[PDB]
Amino acid sequence: MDAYSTRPLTLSHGSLEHVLLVPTASFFIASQLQEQFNKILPEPTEGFAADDEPTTPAELVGKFLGYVSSLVEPSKVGQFDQVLNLCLTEFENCYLEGNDIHALAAKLLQENDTTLVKTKELIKNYITARIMAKRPQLVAIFGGQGNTDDYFEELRDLYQTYHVLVGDLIKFSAETLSELIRTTLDAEKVFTQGLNILEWLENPSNTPDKDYLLSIPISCPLIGVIQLAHYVVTAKLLGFTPGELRSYLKGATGHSQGLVTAVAIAETDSWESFFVSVRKAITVLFFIGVRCYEAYPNTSLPPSILEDSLENNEGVPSPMLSISNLTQEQVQDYVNKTNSHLPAGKQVEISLVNGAKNLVVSGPPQSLYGLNLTLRKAKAPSGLDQSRIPFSERKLKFSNRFLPVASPFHSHLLVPASDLINKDLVKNNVSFNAKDIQIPVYDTFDGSDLRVLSGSISERIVDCIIRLPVKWETTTQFKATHILDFGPGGASGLGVLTHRNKDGTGVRVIVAGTLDINPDDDYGFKQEIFDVTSNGLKKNPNWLEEYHPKLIKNKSXXXXXXXXXXXXXXXXXXXXXXXXXXXXXXXXXXXXXXXXXXXXXXXXXX
């Protein structure tokens, strides 16, 4: 038949073996999901689930047929098995000719309308419909504790979009994690939000409490999941292996919480070597969050400090604190001003050195709240005094907001369980971390190859997290062209922060989202497009110094332009103009005829 409803696309008549099962489908695409949906097409045009691109009918035909389909590989009869496929292949030659419809999703955002969730839907309406019964320089960066408040609604949408591409590891890792809680004692009495992570996907009505979903022994292994769930679609929808993906690299430099996958992605040969490489990550990550919680748990705060925290609008008073928009060491004075009197058990330490202007400080929260007092001291109240001699006396502008982090990471109170887990890592045969590092994974601090064993590597992996800062600019050190990031979702979690650091450099890419914002850190669709690479220019190599030899011996003309305000009002400045410079002269009393009759007199003698 055809795609009806104000946007036409025919369906080829296959001479009477489809076109009697086409009324099984087309009159079922005459369902009320399209026929209460085409009256909204005239006045609020393509408002809701109808025809926003001319092939939006071709996917809802293709998806709804796949949704009431055979639905299991022991397939139902051809109306739910094969009339998809001829409709698929006719769709496959209709608008895409291949070319990886994520690229057409950018061409769905640009050529047709800007509805990302409808842009995202048709891929799911392609991919599950595709797999149904048939049709089967680079730097990597992982993230950690990033600018993300969910870590899971990000993930829950990812499994909802690509059920084909994650459901194996979803089945893999949640099984291990539901077994990981039992295997160590004194962990079962920590996880009273019970760790059936698979359940929370299909059942978020009794989801984990979102604040307790931000907690350490629910989230620290969970961050490894989303980068894994993004690594597999990077393999599967490119049709590659991670061993194929580990070939085309130059970097593999993960964050503090994400260094574990950087080691795990340094060593991943094939898809069965993938899962032990998963088991590298999760079994490292799972034992981390529980023991530091046993080393130090969440302090439930008295409600007066709950008040004053949000009065300054820094947010939830969690034991981790960030500052932006300053140079260094001024805060370090104020740390000393706090730690002049505070106990060693209540000491304050600057944690992370990400960003030449930004800093992160963790510690016991009241002490970090105590820092916020002298942060409020000497603070500009965001009233205007830059217009009154700014670079002599003006107080400075900050961002004293907190972090969604349950534990004081990179601290000096998180010493002992890091030494305890070293026994707990060699208990079960995953702590090898051999010479199978192919690409040199840069360390967070002093970013070596990491295959400098005499580390028994997953102790330095422990040691780099809660003992030491990051110093992220020195960490990076890239002779790169682009950077893939696998941070915890969005254009907020450490994707921009690399770009915020270095400029004149790569065109850094983040796996999450088919969205974009602007040509800053473009992403999503470039993973498998064609014929249009980008290149964020080296604003240093480009537009620098100059010297030459012209067509007729001249330059571009002697770089100096000068213009006074009283000393540019005669024939006198026309001698320097007669010399070797650019002279600009105006504003000479009488607007009429003065410096006008004089202009030719400034021209004849020019």
Side-chain angles (χ1 to χ4, degrees), residues 1-527 536 541 549 557-606:
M1 276 302 118
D2 55 337
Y4 64 101
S5 181
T6 73
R7 292 301 173 273
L9 168 67
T10 178
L11 166 65
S12 52
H13 302 274
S15 53
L16 254 190
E17 66 259 9
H18 322 92
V19 305
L20 84 165
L21 314 166
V22 170
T24 319
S26 48
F27 284 75
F28 271 9
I29 216 63
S31 87
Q32 217 50 254
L33 221 66
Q34 323 302 318
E35 261 77 359
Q36 267 319 106
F37 286 59
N38 42 10
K39 194 256 292 180
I40 209 167
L41 293 183
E43 298 170 350
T45 314
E46 294 114 9
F48 167 72
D51 308 285
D52 72 322
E53 97 172 354
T55 86
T56 312
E59 287 98 46
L60 54 85
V61 166
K63 189 52 220 77
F64 157 73
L65 203 157
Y67 213 82
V68 295
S69 47
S70 283
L71 293 160
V72 206
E73 188 141 319
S75 174
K76 295 175 185 176
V77 67
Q79 44 89 35
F80 287 153
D81 180 71
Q82 68 99 36
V83 83
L84 195 63
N85 304 121
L86 186 85
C87 179
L88 287 168
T89 321
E90 185 163 350
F91 161 69
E92 195 173 2
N93 324 304
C94 89
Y95 194 37
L96 59 148
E97 60 263 35
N99 274 110
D100 197 275
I101 72 159
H102 269 207
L104 279 80
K107 304 186 178 191
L108 204 161
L109 293 172
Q110 292 149 51
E111 312 160 351
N112 276 100
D113 48 340
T114 72
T115 164
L116 267 301
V117 301
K118 187 146 200 213
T119 315
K120 278 192 167 191
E121 161 179 300
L122 306 177
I123 322 162
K124 179 257 292 180
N125 295 15
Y126 166 72
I127 285 184
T128 300
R130 160 171 165 87
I131 310 295
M132 256 311 293
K134 283 183 192 170
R135 296 290 164 169
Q137 300 172 314
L138 188 47
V139 178
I141 289 187
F142 299 96
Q145 285 315 299
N147 313 332
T148 300
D149 50 352
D150 70 9
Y151 313 124
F152 178 50
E153 318 278 329
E154 154 62 54
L155 180 50
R156 214 191 289 155
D157 297 347
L158 191 53
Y159 153 70
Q160 279 165 135
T161 316
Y162 307 132
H163 306 263
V164 183
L165 318 166
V166 74
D168 46 359
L169 274 307
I170 285 303
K171 192 63 179 181
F172 168 69
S173 300
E175 180 67 30
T176 307
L177 284 158
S178 46
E179 270 285 336
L180 264 173
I181 44 178
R182 276 82 155 262
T183 38
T184 164
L185 273 305
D186 215 345
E188 298 85 346
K189 306 171 184 180
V190 185
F191 280 57
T192 192
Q193 34 184 356
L195 207 76
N196 228 346
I197 315 105
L198 184 131
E199 191 264 1
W200 319 327
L201 305 162
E202 58 264 3
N203 177 76
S205 292
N206 214 5
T207 189
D209 297 289
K210 139 197 157 184
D211 44 355
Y212 278 165
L213 183 73
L214 306 156
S215 83
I216 42 164
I218 195 174
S219 304
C220 311
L222 179 143
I223 294 307
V225 186
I226 183 72
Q227 46 199 23
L228 196 86
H230 260 293
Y231 210 93
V232 52
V233 56
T234 322
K236 278 183 179 160
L237 219 60
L238 206 38
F240 285 1
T241 72
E244 188 76 22
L245 287 192
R246 84 181 168 172
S247 85
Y248 323 112
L249 307 173
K250 217 197 167 190
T253 81
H255 218 69
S256 44
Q257 195 182 4
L259 207 69
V260 298
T261 324
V263 179
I265 217 64
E267 49 176 0
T268 302
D269 170 82
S270 167
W271 284 5
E272 264 174 271
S273 82
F274 193 56
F275 305 143
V276 52
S277 315
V278 187
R279 221 198 179 194
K280 291 169 205 144
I282 45 163
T283 59
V284 160
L285 276 170
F286 161 73
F287 268 97
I288 279 165
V290 50
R291 304 294 163 171
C292 55
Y293 189 80
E294 288 157 303
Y296 171 63
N298 189 9
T299 295
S300 302
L301 186 79
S304 69
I305 326 179
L306 181 144
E307 185 71 29
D308 47 58
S309 45
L310 197 59
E311 303 324 294
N312 205 30
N313 294 306
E314 306 169 343
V316 176
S318 90
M320 190 155 294
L321 192 52
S322 61
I323 41 172
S324 157
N325 196 26
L326 201 47
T327 67
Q328 268 64 29
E329 64 79 27
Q330 316 146 252
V331 302
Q332 191 34 71
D333 312 325
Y334 314 147
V335 181
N336 307 346
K337 284 148 206 183
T338 56
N339 294 341
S340 41
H341 48 268
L342 293 169
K346 304 195 176 189
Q347 262 168 349
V348 182
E349 190 205 334
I350 162 175
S351 64
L352 313 174
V353 203
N354 48 321
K357 39 184 175 173
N358 319 312
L359 288 174
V360 187
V361 170
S362 204
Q366 278 201 60
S367 74
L368 314 182
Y369 169 64
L371 189 52
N372 289 291
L373 321 175
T374 194
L375 288 164
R376 281 153 78 176
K377 298 245 172 187
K379 174 145 191 156
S382 76
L384 182 48
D385 46 356
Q386 192 185 358
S387 313
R388 299 295 167 262
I389 312 299
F391 290 74
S392 73
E393 282 195 59
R394 175 202 175 200
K395 297 156 193 174
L396 313 165
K397 291 194 158 184
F398 302 130
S399 86
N400 305 151
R401 52 170 190 85
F402 286 95
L403 282 89
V405 181
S407 172
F409 280 177
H410 305 261
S411 78
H412 292 348
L413 65 152
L414 266 190
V415 51
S418 69
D419 211 4
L420 157 75
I421 193 187
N422 292 320
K423 308 197 180 309
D424 313 331
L425 276 152
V426 294
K427 283 175 188 176
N428 41 13
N429 210 3
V430 165
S431 44
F432 74 108
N433 274 348
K435 279 143 193 159
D436 208 78
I437 302 172
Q438 319 299 324
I439 310 301
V441 47
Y442 285 174
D443 308 332
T444 70
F445 164 70
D446 200 286
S448 90
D449 187 277
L450 193 43
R451 206 36 198 167
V452 197
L453 187 77
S454 81
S456 199
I457 289 188
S458 162
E459 173 192 359
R460 152 76 197 181
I461 308 298
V462 190
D463 197 279
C464 58
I465 297 171
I466 43 173
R467 198 47 200 174
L468 321 170
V470 171
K471 274 173 190 179
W472 182 258
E473 288 91 307
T474 59
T475 308
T476 43
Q477 207 265 324
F478 292 134
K479 318 175 295 187
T481 320
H482 308 274
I483 300 172
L484 264 173
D485 298 343
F486 283 76
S492 41
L494 290 170
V496 286
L497 194 47
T498 45
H499 147 72
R500 261 96 59 87
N501 285 316
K502 305 171 158 181
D503 291 301
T505 36
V507 205
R508 312 162 152 107
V509 182
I510 174 62
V511 288
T514 68
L515 181 54
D516 205 349
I517 38 168
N518 78 297
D520 178 274
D521 48 344
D522 310 326
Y523 66 101
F525 65 98
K526 317 142 84 185
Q527 59 153 342

